[model samples]
Target: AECSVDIQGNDQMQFNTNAITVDKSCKQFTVNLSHPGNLPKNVMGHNWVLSTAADMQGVVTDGMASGLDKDYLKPDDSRVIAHTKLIGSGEKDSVTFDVSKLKEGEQYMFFCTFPGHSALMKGTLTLK
Candidate 1:
């Protein structure tokens, strides 16, 4: 099997999983995200953004101000490790990044930067 994960976002502003473990054996990893709900992107969009736990809030705040055209993320924000495009119902997006970006015992997180969604669409990520 490959080092990848599939996650779903719903209209309820939640992710199906709360934690993700990245295998150290893999040189890279991919995150696939889908929104199975019936809402449009404007009302229920979701994206997968990776960053250190401490930077999540700042990233989200900046992303919110960055607008939807930038996929709800700050343009060229180096704090972002990897991220998928903002998606809506029946739409999907994927992001692949080098595993070296993650460090053992460090705090990392994956969250949606769509306006108010982060409060419920965030989760933890770790390297095994």
Candidate 2:
């Protein structure tokens, strides 16, 4: 089944796509992110972080405080459902998670927690 997606984060501070829906038939799902800009990672670093929509704001806030050395995420944070490593121009990263981790009907969110990026680099996630 179509269980993977390719997303892009460019210099525009936006995710090329704004939403994702995982198919329940897949045992695992993958999110692949790539940067197609000239800017460097430290300057425009991006990562894919997944969590409940209700927890996204706090996740991004905490991640910003944690800094990028730890991939801009709270160290081993329990609220994060899945994530990719911080990457930059011409770089790509991917994260795979068990489809079972998602609960149907529960709202989910995906975003880049880079310092000021989440304001524009976020998307909704659905399990179908």
Candidate 3:
């Protein structure tokens, strides 16, 4: 509650919340991503991808090459500030990043990079 956000991803390609506010006072922040759907990873896999709003399309484009083995994201992709591991129904994952990586007035976005999921599985992240 102090420095973490709880979020859920379902088979319908939607996140429970549309946005999150990160407190800049925190040294680090954590994102706990959960999948309540029953679909398997191949059928409806989801991974939390974080990057600047402007870089969303590019990161997702390159992420395609990384495959499920790489969690559909390029390894060591500098544009990504942070991300959780790929998860399927009933599974869960979490990611923590330095709060300093986030800047006030900057628009950050988190979305699922599982191919077509981007159209519905996306959200905004901001610092307060």
TM-score ranking of the models = 1, 2, 3
Candidate 2: worst 10 consecutive residues by lDDT?
67-76
Any residue pairs clashing in model 2, and if so which?
none
Show where candidate 3 strays beyond 4 Å.
Answer: none
- The candidate, 2 or 3, that scores higher on lDDT is 2
lDDT tens digits by residue: candidate 1, 16-35: 99999899999999998999
In candidate 2, residue 42 scores what lDDT? 90
Which whole-number lDDT from 0 to 100 does residue 105 have in model 1?
77
Q: After superposition, how far is residue 117 of candidate 1 from its true place, in Å?
A: 0.5
C-alpha lDDT of residue 8 in model 3: 91
Q: Write the per-residue lDDT of candidate 3 for residues 2-115, one digit (tens) a residue.
A: 889999998888899888888778899999999997999988898888899999998898887678888889888999999999899999999999998887778999998888
TM-score, candidate number 1: 0.97
TM-score of each: 0.97, 0.97, 0.96
Give the per-residue Cα lDDT of candidate 2 at 109: 95
Off by over 4 Å in 2: none
lDDT of 2 by residue, 1-128 (tens): 39999999999898998889898899999998999989998999999999999999889999999986998999889899999999989999999999999987799999999999998999898887
Give the best candidate by lDDT.
Answer: 1
